[PDB]
Design a protein around this ligand. Sequence first.
Ligand SMILES: N[C@@H](CCC(=O)N[C@@H](CS)C(=O)NCC(=O)O)C(=O)O
Ligand SMILES: N[C@@H](CCC(=O)N[C@@H](CS)C(=O)NCC(=O)O)C(=O)O
Lengths: 206, 205
Amino acid sequence: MPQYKLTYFDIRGLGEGARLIFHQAGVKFEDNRLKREDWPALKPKTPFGQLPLLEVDGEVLAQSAAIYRYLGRQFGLAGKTPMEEAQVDSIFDQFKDFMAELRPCFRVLAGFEEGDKEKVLKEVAVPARDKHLPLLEKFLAKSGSEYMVGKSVTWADLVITDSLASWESLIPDFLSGHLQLKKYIEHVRELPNIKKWIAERPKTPY
Amino acid sequence: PQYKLTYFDIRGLGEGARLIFHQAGVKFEDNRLKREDWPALKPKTPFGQLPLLEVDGEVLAQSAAIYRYLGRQFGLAGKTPMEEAQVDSIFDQFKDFMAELRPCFRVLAGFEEGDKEKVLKEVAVPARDKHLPLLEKFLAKSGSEYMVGKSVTWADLVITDSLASWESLIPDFLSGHLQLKKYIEHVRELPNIKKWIAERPKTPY
Ligand SMILES: N[C@@H](CCC(=O)N[C@@H](CS)C(=O)NCC(=O)O)C(=O)O
Ligand SMILES: N[C@@H](CCC(=O)N[C@@H](CS)C(=O)NCC(=O)O)C(=O)O
């Protein structure tokens, strides 16, 4: 019977991954969404000067992926064997590589930063998309099941599909050409607890 | 359990796995691949990249996933679920640091054209000044000589090895951080590590 507090900004972003993992498992936690007002005071008190942070009975854990994995293993959403857990880690790291291409160009694409959206799409987004999506889809085809690894949902599934779904809003036809991913995203987000959470969670830009 | 690590001749991302094996005294095929063989292998890999670890025939990709898998197998991952997550956390912070530098490696090394001085002042030195204190802070809270717990973990082995390599490419890379240097020495003092460091193929990186 452990007590959980997640500290992140109002947006979904990196924090949403943890939230999704809680709601899937049906585990209650404090969704501490932090006001911009309070960030300057908290920042120097954090391990690395950033959020998200997970508090577990007082103890602090930083870095989102470490948070995802910790929650995943605690809730049996990490894989049924040691090699499976690794395969889960593996596919998410590849997703992380993909994100490493896109995220630095997010704000120009969202319009928050001055720049040539059309250029970025052709010179950064669409090439990244074209390289990485086939690799995620290939991996997904190993399984034959509806998930990247195993016959049931894992934490990597929850975080990946949510992020891809959101990026579909910034980039038209982002998933066009990859229906196996489109189904995969449709499936995970139709899971009852996820489906519920998506309906109730705050509407934020990203 | 037959262990086979596939990577290129250089240390790079593959070295992390090698260090974890040697520290645990576990035997493995250190398969270092010729450039000549990369075009044929690449399409037959999960993500088109190395390193790969295969154990009894099954292939595992992505270096960090390889580090953690091996570390957990050899009791080098942490002593509790929270300690394990903490090992992941400090290493993820370390990857963020590397994410700043690694894209600038080839210019700093001279494999690609560019102003080395400008890169140092505008990217390398800033990245260093932001991140080293964070690593040093995390190490300082530990009390022990390692990032987490009282014994060495896979994150210690990969971090210290990587930090040691970057001394070369960045002037005074660890100048104002006596704690980090001592920690790098200590982890690399460990018998199996000191041994492997001496035996391993002399590559620059
Ligand atoms: N590698 C970190 C990245 C965390 C991160 O970049 N957080 C941003 C928000 S997405 C942040 O805290 N910005 C405020 C700041 O850095 O001062 C992780 O995965 O958790
Ligand atoms: N995210 C991957 C990165 C692996 C990677 O970038 N490998 C490079 C060498 S360091 C490679 O395979 N280059 C050959 C190629 O991609 O075709 C990991 O951590 O394992």
